[PDB]
């Protein structure tokens, strides 16, 4: 319930305007390499933080968790939990969004320089 | 490796974090000659069977500690001093009971660390959601729990004692209307099995009742009793769980499942109700009846405003969704320092459970 303190990716989250993307990997939140931004494994689940810095120093946060059609239950469950934990860490100020493969919001799609792309496979289940 | 224990009003679901299902599932009952769990129902020389968590709230802490002893030492066969323990609690669990749970874990079992999670939250996580309304129908209690962005909305939560135990009793009564007398503890367990195996929800009750009278063969199924004799089970198959939607059938004044879901949604901010309607999540054994999702979809659509999008999610393993959510939660890298340690409890007192577990 309280905010996460030490996890290195939470320390990185929401510090400045930008787009931060993590993948659930065996019960952990692992950063997605920059060159893979926007290419989602349909076997996996992901967490996305969009930070918008209004020109008055204030930060606006949108948290999106994306569920691939073949992701395992540990992965989708962890994506939701991590989303709440990141919101907690940002003092409850993030707006959360559930994003399912092929049913994503136009806001979520709009983040990506040339839209969402999908590929088969992913990391194995933690179960 | 963490232990996950879901303290059910009727069934303890326990096992190891990181497993995809609970390995030890047994009744949350005490038999006074103490016997715990399955042994308590198999002994003839029993004064009384006691439910220490009868309607999801612990009432006898000494009996609850006996159930936990049996869980750790007879079922899981682990040393509690070597494992963090995730325990579940009902929504709206009284503060003094959360404190007593913590005290017993640290002072009676010497666990190194523990945590307490709300059952409905865990089920929502197991479905891959942070927002929705969980309808958790168990053995001695049904909870209706709206949740937004990871937190229950306490002013909108409903609890009723009506659940699976009442439906077992109703099935017993319906059979009595035919001259069968299932009365003994063993006979009651047979009726529970008939209920689980053969019942189903009628999408059109009036038409299913007409079929059972005029075309009985299309409703009727035989059930094999432990001695091999067969009994015919007809309209009971759908009349029994119909009580969940129309509780006057069992003499109760509480509303049906759908009405209570609707009233809970109506206690929430109008601007999240659309999300709740599209994220109705069923959990617990008494939501396992065939066709219940479609029936609830139809009822909720008829109650909701024009063009409201309704979705009922009925996950196939939902008898264990609470436990599975806990197994996921307690496996996460970020959960490693969310446990209450023994040393924090000694430092801050039992009050720590309110500041670390919510
Ligand atoms: N397949 C089923 N169909 C109908 N009822 C079921 C089924 N399986 C289990 N139940 C009932 O669900 C109840 C147990 O559910 P559970 O969610 O474990 O309750 P609790 O958490 O309150 O102990 C029992 O009344 C049991 O008879
Ligand atoms: Ca995967
Ligand atoms: Ca928020
Ligand atoms: Mg339960």
XYZ file of C-alpha atoms and ligand atoms in Angstrom:
515
model
C 0.000 0.000 0.000
C 2.787 2.421 0.872
C 5.046 3.542 -1.911
C 7.953 1.413 -3.111
C 11.235 2.826 -1.824
C 14.250 1.170 -3.420
C 13.443 -0.514 -6.723
C 15.790 1.161 -9.252
C 13.100 1.612 -11.900
C 10.697 3.321 -9.513
C 13.504 5.757 -8.622
C 13.635 6.569 -12.353
C 9.878 6.900 -12.874
C 8.187 10.196 -13.642
C 11.116 12.498 -12.872
C 10.808 14.523 -16.080
C 8.598 14.715 -19.173
C 8.918 11.700 -21.409
C 7.763 8.179 -22.169
C 8.946 5.244 -20.039
C 8.139 1.638 -20.926
C 8.738 -1.520 -18.882
C 7.961 -5.185 -19.508
C 6.918 -7.685 -16.859
C 9.618 -10.372 -16.698
C 9.356 -13.175 -14.117
C 7.636 -11.005 -11.491
C 9.924 -7.948 -12.037
C 9.553 -4.618 -13.852
C 12.272 -4.497 -16.514
C 12.924 -1.493 -18.807
C 12.260 -1.953 -22.514
C 15.273 -1.076 -24.710
C 14.750 2.262 -26.484
C 14.995 0.699 -29.957
C 12.061 -1.559 -29.108
C 9.707 1.215 -27.993
C 6.322 0.578 -29.572
C 6.948 -3.060 -30.602
C 4.957 -5.208 -28.196
C 5.339 -8.953 -27.679
C 1.831 -10.404 -27.707
C 3.028 -13.076 -25.268
C 3.793 -10.423 -22.642
C 2.466 -7.615 -20.478
C 3.872 -4.107 -20.175
C 3.611 -0.931 -18.107
C 3.885 2.519 -19.735
C 4.290 5.895 -18.018
C 3.653 9.094 -19.995
C 4.884 12.154 -18.079
C 3.783 15.515 -19.426
C 5.473 18.579 -17.984
C 3.147 21.533 -18.185
C 5.099 24.754 -18.845
C 4.527 25.683 -15.141
C 6.719 22.903 -13.733
C 3.779 20.628 -12.924
C 3.922 16.989 -13.989
C 0.905 15.121 -15.352
C 1.059 11.337 -15.313
C -0.759 8.688 -17.315
C -0.074 5.029 -16.532
C -1.091 2.432 -19.123
C -0.684 -1.312 -18.726
C -0.816 -3.329 -21.939
C -1.832 -6.983 -22.053
C -0.859 -9.158 -24.998
C -3.382 -11.785 -26.040
C -0.968 -14.631 -25.164
C 0.467 -13.264 -21.893
C 0.275 -15.471 -18.859
C -1.778 -14.717 -15.778
C 1.250 -13.914 -13.600
C 2.236 -11.287 -16.207
C -1.138 -9.556 -16.540
C -1.665 -9.696 -12.782
C 1.792 -8.234 -12.174
C 1.213 -5.486 -14.764
C -1.908 -4.347 -12.901
C -0.200 -4.509 -9.506
C 2.853 -2.613 -10.742
C 0.526 0.051 -12.177
C -1.092 0.666 -8.784
C 2.353 0.688 -7.132
C 3.674 3.289 -9.576
C 0.563 5.410 -8.961
C 1.185 5.103 -5.189
C 4.788 6.118 -5.788
C 3.572 9.187 -7.673
C 1.296 10.024 -4.724
C -1.875 8.826 -6.461
C -1.693 11.492 -9.178
C -1.467 9.151 -12.185
C -4.497 8.290 -14.280
C -4.523 4.538 -14.933
C -5.524 2.920 -18.226
C -6.041 -0.763 -19.081
C -4.868 -1.426 -22.659
C -5.718 -4.743 -24.291
C -4.157 -5.857 -27.578
C -6.195 -4.556 -30.478
C -8.476 -2.462 -28.242
C -6.016 0.218 -27.151
C -7.126 3.786 -26.516
C -6.312 6.394 -29.151
C -4.367 8.249 -26.442
C -2.105 5.249 -25.933
C -1.648 4.681 -29.666
C -0.870 8.385 -30.081
C 2.238 8.154 -27.910
C 4.099 6.153 -30.522
C 5.968 7.770 -33.385
C 4.369 5.472 -35.986
C 1.767 3.592 -33.985
C 1.741 0.302 -32.152
C 3.364 -2.803 -33.626
C 2.911 -6.405 -32.460
C 5.122 -9.468 -32.588
C 4.738 -13.059 -31.479
C 6.499 -14.514 -28.459
C 7.854 -13.039 -25.278
C 9.439 -13.961 -21.968
C 8.343 -17.157 -20.248
C 5.851 -17.205 -17.383
C 7.035 -16.827 -13.815
C 4.621 -19.596 -12.781
C 9.488 -18.260 -0.317
C 6.247 -16.762 0.910
C 3.230 -18.671 2.104
C -0.187 -17.566 0.899
C -3.180 -18.340 3.102
C -6.698 -17.321 2.072
C -8.843 -17.533 5.233
C -12.218 -18.481 3.800
C -15.477 -18.569 5.708
C -15.804 -22.186 4.614
C -12.513 -23.269 2.991
C -8.874 -22.405 3.690
C -6.929 -22.021 0.442
C -3.202 -22.238 1.148
C 0.064 -22.790 -0.661
C 3.351 -21.370 -1.888
C 3.837 -18.004 -3.559
C 4.773 -18.447 -7.184
C 2.595 -21.517 -7.664
C -0.357 -21.041 -10.000
C -2.860 -22.719 -7.625
C -3.230 -23.478 -3.882
C -1.816 -26.898 -2.997
C -3.746 -27.358 0.291
C -7.487 -26.622 0.369
C -9.499 -27.737 3.382
C -12.542 -26.695 5.439
C -12.189 -23.829 7.939
C -14.003 -25.822 10.621
C -13.198 -27.125 14.105
C -14.692 -30.302 15.540
C -15.055 -30.455 19.333
C -14.745 -34.019 20.685
C -9.820 -30.641 18.685
C -10.155 -31.849 15.107
C -9.449 -29.473 12.224
C -10.480 -29.506 8.588
C -11.392 -32.787 6.916
C -10.838 -34.849 10.066
C -13.528 -32.738 11.748
C -16.229 -33.984 9.351
C -15.231 -37.671 9.383
C -15.424 -38.273 13.158
C -18.792 -39.551 14.402
C -18.266 -38.624 18.063
C -18.555 -34.870 17.561
C -20.424 -32.549 19.909
C -20.382 -29.605 17.490
C -18.715 -28.323 14.342
C -17.477 -24.733 14.761
C -16.910 -22.130 12.025
C -14.428 -19.603 13.486
C -14.738 -17.374 10.378
C -18.418 -17.969 9.816
C -19.250 -14.972 7.651
C -15.733 -13.961 6.674
C -14.928 -12.185 9.962
C -12.878 -14.110 12.562
C -14.845 -14.554 15.778
C -12.776 -17.079 17.776
C -9.073 -16.301 17.711
C -8.034 -19.427 19.592
C -9.821 -21.595 17.005
C -8.329 -19.505 14.177
C -4.857 -20.152 15.578
C -5.643 -23.889 15.560
C -6.597 -23.655 11.878
C -3.321 -21.840 11.136
C -1.342 -24.470 13.108
C -3.010 -27.170 11.022
C -2.307 -25.172 7.847
C 1.423 -24.778 8.534
C 2.307 -28.050 10.245
C -0.174 -30.641 8.958
C -0.950 -29.392 5.450
C 1.880 -27.272 4.027
C 4.423 -28.947 6.355
C 6.597 -25.869 6.713
C 8.265 -23.951 9.534
C 6.446 -20.595 9.871
C 9.636 -19.075 11.340
C 11.274 -19.483 7.908
C 8.648 -17.922 5.634
C 6.860 -14.607 5.205
C 3.120 -15.169 5.335
C 0.511 -13.367 3.224
C -2.906 -13.558 4.864
C -6.215 -12.523 3.346
C -9.058 -10.618 4.968
C -12.577 -9.660 4.151
C -13.479 -6.167 2.993
C -14.441 -3.934 5.955
C -12.477 -6.128 8.352
C -12.608 -4.564 11.847
C -9.385 -2.881 12.893
C -8.968 -4.901 16.100
C -9.111 -8.120 14.076
C -6.368 -6.916 11.711
C -4.249 -6.205 14.791
C -5.021 -9.618 16.318
C -3.986 -11.371 13.088
C -0.646 -9.576 13.194
C -0.119 -10.320 16.883
C -0.812 -14.040 16.457
C 1.492 -14.365 13.462
C 4.430 -12.734 15.270
C 3.837 -13.827 18.894
C 2.350 -17.330 18.418
C 4.029 -18.474 15.185
C 7.201 -16.346 15.210
C 6.931 -15.582 11.495
C 9.748 -13.355 10.178
C 7.308 -11.163 8.244
C 3.668 -10.974 7.222
C 1.155 -8.957 5.204
C -2.645 -8.723 5.058
C -4.536 -8.281 1.758
C -8.216 -7.746 0.974
C -9.681 -10.776 -0.821
C -11.498 -8.729 -3.485
C -8.360 -6.744 -4.312
C -6.425 -9.956 -4.899
C -9.143 -11.350 -7.178
C -9.176 -8.130 -9.184
C -5.390 -8.326 -9.645
C -5.611 -11.973 -10.678
C -7.994 -10.863 -13.494
C -5.414 -8.290 -14.669
C -7.377 -5.182 -13.641
C -7.020 -2.224 -11.270
C -10.624 -1.012 -11.565
C -13.812 -3.047 -11.419
C -16.543 -4.383 -9.154
C -15.804 -7.780 -7.631
C -18.722 -10.038 -6.728
C -17.149 -12.628 -4.426
C -19.628 -15.318 -3.393
C -18.038 -17.836 -1.057
C -19.423 -20.195 1.573
C -20.780 -18.060 4.433
C -20.604 -14.607 2.837
C -20.999 -12.705 -0.428
C -19.061 -9.460 -0.874
C -19.799 -6.784 -3.481
C -16.691 -4.617 -3.770
C -16.219 -1.655 -6.101
C -12.535 -0.889 -6.685
C -10.969 2.130 -8.413
C -7.309 2.371 -9.400
C -6.289 -0.245 -6.878
C -8.368 0.756 -3.842
C -11.691 -0.474 -2.524
C -14.413 2.169 -2.192
C -15.576 1.420 1.367
C -18.795 3.476 1.297
C -20.005 1.372 -1.649
C -19.108 -2.117 -0.376
C -21.908 -4.567 0.445
C -21.802 -7.756 2.475
C -24.512 -10.397 2.838
C -24.373 -13.702 4.725
C -26.133 -15.403 1.780
C -23.751 -17.678 -0.155
C -22.902 -21.318 -0.895
C -23.677 -22.698 2.574
C -27.237 -21.395 2.343
C -27.585 -23.000 -1.093
C -26.450 -26.380 0.228
C -29.129 -26.121 2.935
C -31.729 -25.117 0.344
C -30.866 -28.146 -1.791
C -31.320 -30.316 1.300
C -34.747 -28.757 1.853
C -35.745 -29.212 -1.799
C -34.853 -32.892 -1.604
C -36.885 -33.146 1.627
C -39.890 -32.093 -0.475
C -39.457 -35.537 -2.110
C -39.026 -37.709 0.965
C -35.237 -37.846 1.026
C -33.794 -36.902 4.406
C -30.198 -35.754 4.085
C -29.465 -34.769 7.686
C -26.141 -36.132 9.001
C -22.836 -34.356 8.484
C -21.933 -36.939 5.819
C -25.293 -36.588 4.042
C -24.926 -32.801 3.990
C -21.567 -33.206 2.259
C -23.226 -35.420 -0.369
C -25.835 -32.709 -0.986
C -23.030 -30.136 -1.321
C -21.493 -32.379 -3.986
C -24.810 -32.752 -5.836
C -25.148 -28.940 -5.840
C -21.649 -28.366 -7.200
C -21.881 -31.164 -9.778
C -25.367 -30.735 -11.203
C -26.763 -27.245 -10.556
C -26.941 -24.537 -13.199
C -28.431 -21.066 -13.560
C -31.592 -20.746 -15.643
C -31.373 -17.952 -18.207
C -35.188 -18.094 -18.455
C -36.440 -19.528 -15.153
C -40.123 -19.692 -16.097
C -39.315 -21.601 -19.282
C -36.848 -23.960 -17.565
C -39.532 -24.728 -14.967
C -42.048 -25.474 -17.735
C -39.540 -27.864 -19.316
C -38.892 -29.625 -15.999
C -42.613 -30.349 -15.593
C -43.639 -31.176 -19.171
C -40.337 -32.436 -20.646
C -38.593 -33.693 -17.526
C -35.989 -35.657 -19.514
C -34.403 -32.433 -20.792
C -33.651 -31.199 -17.240
C -33.196 -34.378 -15.240
C -29.850 -35.907 -14.364
C -29.088 -38.933 -12.208
C -26.685 -38.659 -9.276
C -24.751 -41.678 -7.968
C -24.807 -41.838 -4.169
C -21.790 -43.322 -2.362
C -23.615 -46.676 -2.079
C -24.266 -46.749 -5.842
C -27.979 -46.068 -5.758
C -29.111 -43.330 -8.111
C -31.286 -40.337 -7.284
C -33.040 -38.190 -9.841
C -32.188 -34.475 -9.750
C -34.603 -32.354 -11.755
C -35.780 -28.786 -11.207
C -33.554 -28.645 -8.115
C -30.626 -28.174 -10.510
C -31.704 -24.618 -11.318
C -34.126 -23.823 -8.482
C -31.336 -24.078 -5.913
C -28.995 -21.354 -7.265
C -31.946 -19.208 -8.335
C -31.981 -18.224 -4.649
C -28.852 -16.118 -5.356
C -30.993 -13.909 -7.606
C -34.204 -14.140 -5.564
C -33.329 -14.671 -1.896
C -36.907 -14.794 -0.718
C -36.719 -18.401 -1.944
C -34.680 -19.156 1.213
C -36.576 -16.778 3.502
C -34.021 -13.965 3.215
C -34.823 -10.285 2.822
C -31.553 -9.298 1.169
C -31.641 -8.467 -2.559
C -30.387 -10.733 -5.289
C -26.782 -10.670 -6.488
C -27.585 -8.316 -9.380
C -29.564 -5.833 -7.291
C -26.781 -5.573 -4.740
C -24.216 -5.113 -7.527
C -26.372 -2.326 -8.978
C -26.832 -0.587 -5.604
C -23.076 -0.699 -4.979
C -22.391 0.841 -8.407
C -24.989 3.518 -7.635
C -23.072 4.464 -4.472
C -20.024 5.297 -6.627
C -19.243 8.536 -8.434
C -21.371 8.629 -11.577
C -18.219 9.236 -13.630
C -16.651 5.844 -12.796
C -19.835 3.790 -13.040
C -19.246 3.099 -16.755
C -15.922 1.471 -15.848
C -17.507 -0.616 -13.108
C -20.238 -1.851 -15.469
C -17.614 -2.948 -17.997
C -15.540 -4.767 -15.332
C -17.862 -6.952 -13.218
C -15.535 -9.701 -11.958
C -16.938 -12.895 -10.415
C -14.919 -14.688 -7.747
C -15.516 -17.501 -5.289
C -16.980 -20.986 -5.430
C -20.629 -19.887 -5.409
C -20.072 -18.008 -8.688
C -19.177 -21.289 -10.424
C -22.717 -22.200 -11.573
C -22.994 -22.730 -15.326
C -24.557 -19.759 -17.154
C -24.220 -17.386 -14.179
C -22.173 -14.892 -16.215
C -24.737 -14.673 -18.991
C -27.592 -14.425 -16.477
C -25.857 -11.626 -14.599
C -25.048 -9.879 -17.906
C -28.742 -9.912 -18.792
C -29.855 -8.693 -15.366
C -27.253 -5.914 -15.148
C -28.050 -4.715 -18.695
C -31.747 -4.518 -17.772
C -30.969 -2.469 -14.636
C -28.404 -0.141 -16.236
C -29.162 2.942 -18.309
C -29.829 2.767 -22.018
C -26.736 1.770 -23.977
C -24.508 1.134 -20.951
C -21.774 -1.339 -21.882
C -21.880 -4.334 -19.551
C -19.199 -6.974 -19.189
C -19.157 -9.847 -16.688
C -15.789 -11.578 -16.385
C -16.019 -15.181 -15.102
C -12.537 -16.530 -14.935
C -12.328 -20.321 -15.106
C -10.164 -20.678 -11.950
C -12.208 -18.144 -9.924
C -12.755 -20.549 -6.991
C -9.067 -19.743 -6.321
C -8.742 -16.192 -7.673
C -8.086 -14.659 -4.250
C -5.261 -17.085 -3.624
C -3.803 -16.697 -7.138
C -3.762 -12.919 -6.755
C -1.883 -13.316 -3.488
C 0.628 -15.695 -5.078
C 1.344 -13.085 -7.776
C 1.509 -10.147 -5.374
C 3.837 -11.834 -2.915
C 6.150 -12.961 -5.750
C 6.809 -9.451 -7.090
C 10.280 -7.901 -6.764
C 8.657 -4.738 -5.331
C 6.865 -6.723 -2.590
C 10.181 -7.620 -0.913
C 10.089 -4.646 1.468
C 6.314 -4.325 1.769
C 6.182 -7.135 4.325
C 5.793 -6.131 7.966
C 8.864 -7.517 9.693
C 8.929 -8.841 13.256
C 11.293 -5.990 14.107
C 8.919 -3.332 12.710
C 6.116 -4.903 14.766
C 8.267 -4.741 17.910
C 9.190 -1.134 17.003
C 5.729 0.285 16.204
C 3.263 -2.218 17.725
C 0.245 -3.922 16.094
C -0.830 -0.506 14.783
C 1.778 -1.167 12.069
C -0.716 -3.302 10.144
C -2.853 -0.225 9.306
C 0.109 1.829 8.056
C 1.755 -0.982 6.017
C -1.298 -2.960 4.748
C -3.963 -1.175 2.711
N -18.549 -25.787 -8.927
C -19.311 -25.164 -7.863
N -20.590 -24.809 -8.107
C -21.336 -24.235 -7.133
N -20.822 -24.005 -5.899
C -19.537 -24.363 -5.649
C -18.738 -24.981 -6.639
N -17.537 -25.225 -6.116
C -17.551 -24.791 -4.859
N -18.755 -24.276 -4.552
C -19.228 -23.747 -3.331
O -18.464 -22.536 -3.022
C -18.348 -22.524 -1.537
C -16.885 -22.422 -1.286
O -16.363 -21.259 -1.946
P -15.160 -20.359 -1.434
O -14.977 -19.251 -2.446
O -13.957 -21.210 -1.247
O -15.747 -19.783 -0.064
P -14.950 -19.071 1.141
O -13.774 -18.266 0.619
O -16.026 -18.176 1.793
O -14.439 -20.168 2.076
C -19.001 -23.725 -1.025
O -20.336 -23.400 -0.515
C -19.051 -24.628 -2.160
O -20.118 -25.576 -2.018
Ca 5.158 -13.946 -21.480
Ca -4.501 7.884 -9.387
Mg -13.431 -16.452 -0.048
